[PDB]
């Protein structure tokens, strides 16, 4: 409910759903994550959660705003990793 937790929830989910790109970092396509969220609704505000982590430079993804699933091929790239002990 507090987006502060959701950010870390996001990076964990990305750790499981995401696959490594050429840069060696984990990345997951919006369509894949959105697909899972459409079932459980983990992120009540997925876009806002993405924004939060993009502002923290934890993840990056092409696009500013979106409404339709035309950005589903957009890979959310994990730039900063704090998820794992």
PDB file of C-alpha atoms in Angstrom:
ATOM      1  CA  UNK A   1       0.000   0.000   0.000  1.00  0.00           C
ATOM      2  CA  UNK A   2       2.991   2.222   0.660  1.00  0.00           C
ATOM      3  CA  UNK A   3       4.765   2.463  -2.709  1.00  0.00           C
ATOM      4  CA  UNK A   4       8.077   2.243  -0.845  1.00  0.00           C
ATOM      5  CA  UNK A   5       7.457  -1.486  -0.343  1.00  0.00           C
ATOM      6  CA  UNK A   6       6.042  -1.938  -3.806  1.00  0.00           C
ATOM      7  CA  UNK A   7       9.306  -0.779  -5.353  1.00  0.00           C
ATOM      8  CA  UNK A   8      11.169  -3.629  -3.638  1.00  0.00           C
ATOM      9  CA  UNK A   9       8.320  -5.996  -4.452  1.00  0.00           C
ATOM     10  CA  UNK A  10       8.732  -4.991  -8.090  1.00  0.00           C
ATOM     11  CA  UNK A  11      12.470  -5.695  -8.154  1.00  0.00           C
ATOM     12  CA  UNK A  12      11.858  -9.110  -6.582  1.00  0.00           C
ATOM     13  CA  UNK A  13       9.186  -9.989  -9.148  1.00  0.00           C
ATOM     14  CA  UNK A  14      11.518  -8.760 -11.898  1.00  0.00           C
ATOM     15  CA  UNK A  15      14.199 -11.035 -10.441  1.00  0.00           C
ATOM     16  CA  UNK A  16      11.943 -14.055 -11.005  1.00  0.00           C
ATOM     17  CA  UNK A  17      10.085 -13.013 -14.179  1.00  0.00           C
ATOM     18  CA  UNK A  18      12.997 -11.185 -15.756  1.00  0.00           C
ATOM     19  CA  UNK A  19      15.604 -12.631 -18.064  1.00  0.00           C
ATOM     20  CA  UNK A  20      19.144 -11.357 -18.665  1.00  0.00           C
ATOM     21  CA  UNK A  21      19.740  -9.112 -21.649  1.00  0.00           C
ATOM     22  CA  UNK A  22      23.033  -8.587 -23.501  1.00  0.00           C
ATOM     23  CA  UNK A  23      24.256  -6.239 -20.764  1.00  0.00           C
ATOM     24  CA  UNK A  24      24.016  -9.140 -18.316  1.00  0.00           C
ATOM     25  CA  UNK A  25      21.247  -7.473 -16.342  1.00  0.00           C
ATOM     26  CA  UNK A  26      17.760  -8.825 -15.706  1.00  0.00           C
ATOM     27  CA  UNK A  27      14.990  -7.438 -17.866  1.00  0.00           C
ATOM     28  CA  UNK A  28      11.328  -8.354 -18.254  1.00  0.00           C
ATOM     29  CA  UNK A  29       8.874  -7.240 -20.924  1.00  0.00           C
ATOM     30  CA  UNK A  30       5.949  -5.114 -19.748  1.00  0.00           C
ATOM     31  CA  UNK A  31       3.519  -7.556 -21.328  1.00  0.00           C
ATOM     32  CA  UNK A  32       4.893 -10.427 -19.268  1.00  0.00           C
ATOM     33  CA  UNK A  33       4.747  -8.591 -15.944  1.00  0.00           C
ATOM     34  CA  UNK A  34       1.377  -7.033 -16.800  1.00  0.00           C
ATOM     35  CA  UNK A  35       0.062 -10.504 -17.658  1.00  0.00           C
ATOM     36  CA  UNK A  36       0.866 -11.757 -14.153  1.00  0.00           C
ATOM     37  CA  UNK A  37      -0.463  -8.600 -12.502  1.00  0.00           C
ATOM     38  CA  UNK A  38      -3.745  -8.955 -14.398  1.00  0.00           C
ATOM     39  CA  UNK A  39      -4.235 -12.222 -12.510  1.00  0.00           C
ATOM     40  CA  UNK A  40      -3.183 -11.273  -8.963  1.00  0.00           C
ATOM     41  CA  UNK A  41      -3.164  -7.475  -9.118  1.00  0.00           C
ATOM     42  CA  UNK A  42      -0.006  -7.158  -7.079  1.00  0.00           C
ATOM     43  CA  UNK A  43       0.687  -3.600  -8.105  1.00  0.00           C
ATOM     44  CA  UNK A  44      -2.471  -1.510  -7.757  1.00  0.00           C
ATOM     45  CA  UNK A  45      -0.523   1.168  -9.602  1.00  0.00           C
ATOM     46  CA  UNK A  46       1.933  -0.664 -11.854  1.00  0.00           C
ATOM     47  CA  UNK A  47       2.852   2.431 -13.856  1.00  0.00           C
ATOM     48  CA  UNK A  48       3.483   4.393 -10.675  1.00  0.00           C
ATOM     49  CA  UNK A  49       5.607   1.563  -9.293  1.00  0.00           C
ATOM     50  CA  UNK A  50       7.647   1.509 -12.506  1.00  0.00           C
ATOM     51  CA  UNK A  51       8.035   5.288 -12.278  1.00  0.00           C
ATOM     52  CA  UNK A  52       9.174   5.034  -8.658  1.00  0.00           C
ATOM     53  CA  UNK A  53      11.928   2.570  -9.518  1.00  0.00           C
ATOM     54  CA  UNK A  54      12.859   4.506 -12.665  1.00  0.00           C
ATOM     55  CA  UNK A  55      13.263   7.640 -10.532  1.00  0.00           C
ATOM     56  CA  UNK A  56      15.453   5.637  -8.156  1.00  0.00           C
ATOM     57  CA  UNK A  57      17.386   4.515 -11.253  1.00  0.00           C
ATOM     58  CA  UNK A  58      16.706   0.948 -10.198  1.00  0.00           C
ATOM     59  CA  UNK A  59      15.047   0.065 -13.481  1.00  0.00           C
ATOM     60  CA  UNK A  60      14.792   1.682 -16.878  1.00  0.00           C
ATOM     61  CA  UNK A  61      12.324   1.193 -19.689  1.00  0.00           C
ATOM     62  CA  UNK A  62      11.539   3.076 -22.922  1.00  0.00           C
ATOM     63  CA  UNK A  63       8.379   5.135 -22.738  1.00  0.00           C
ATOM     64  CA  UNK A  64       6.993   7.938 -20.619  1.00  0.00           C
ATOM     65  CA  UNK A  65       3.283   7.136 -20.380  1.00  0.00           C
ATOM     66  CA  UNK A  66       1.122   4.315 -21.717  1.00  0.00           C
ATOM     67  CA  UNK A  67      -2.502   3.185 -21.656  1.00  0.00           C
ATOM     68  CA  UNK A  68      -2.741   0.393 -24.202  1.00  0.00           C
ATOM     69  CA  UNK A  69      -0.661  -2.776 -24.257  1.00  0.00           C
ATOM     70  CA  UNK A  70       1.379  -1.469 -27.177  1.00  0.00           C
ATOM     71  CA  UNK A  71       4.345  -1.092 -24.835  1.00  0.00           C
ATOM     72  CA  UNK A  72       4.122  -4.774 -23.898  1.00  0.00           C
ATOM     73  CA  UNK A  73       7.327  -5.527 -25.821  1.00  0.00           C
ATOM     74  CA  UNK A  74       9.194  -2.964 -23.729  1.00  0.00           C
ATOM     75  CA  UNK A  75      11.782  -4.666 -21.548  1.00  0.00           C
ATOM     76  CA  UNK A  76      12.098  -3.236 -18.066  1.00  0.00           C
ATOM     77  CA  UNK A  77      15.843  -3.333 -17.448  1.00  0.00           C
ATOM     78  CA  UNK A  78      17.167  -3.659 -13.909  1.00  0.00           C
ATOM     79  CA  UNK A  79      20.011  -1.143 -13.631  1.00  0.00           C
ATOM     80  CA  UNK A  80      20.505  -1.233  -9.888  1.00  0.00           C
ATOM     81  CA  UNK A  81      20.321  -4.445  -7.910  1.00  0.00           C
ATOM     82  CA  UNK A  82      19.643  -4.570  -4.198  1.00  0.00           C
ATOM     83  CA  UNK A  83      17.587  -7.728  -4.386  1.00  0.00           C
ATOM     84  CA  UNK A  84      19.435 -10.767  -2.990  1.00  0.00           C
ATOM     85  CA  UNK A  85      21.492 -11.759   0.014  1.00  0.00           C
TER      86      UNK A  85
END
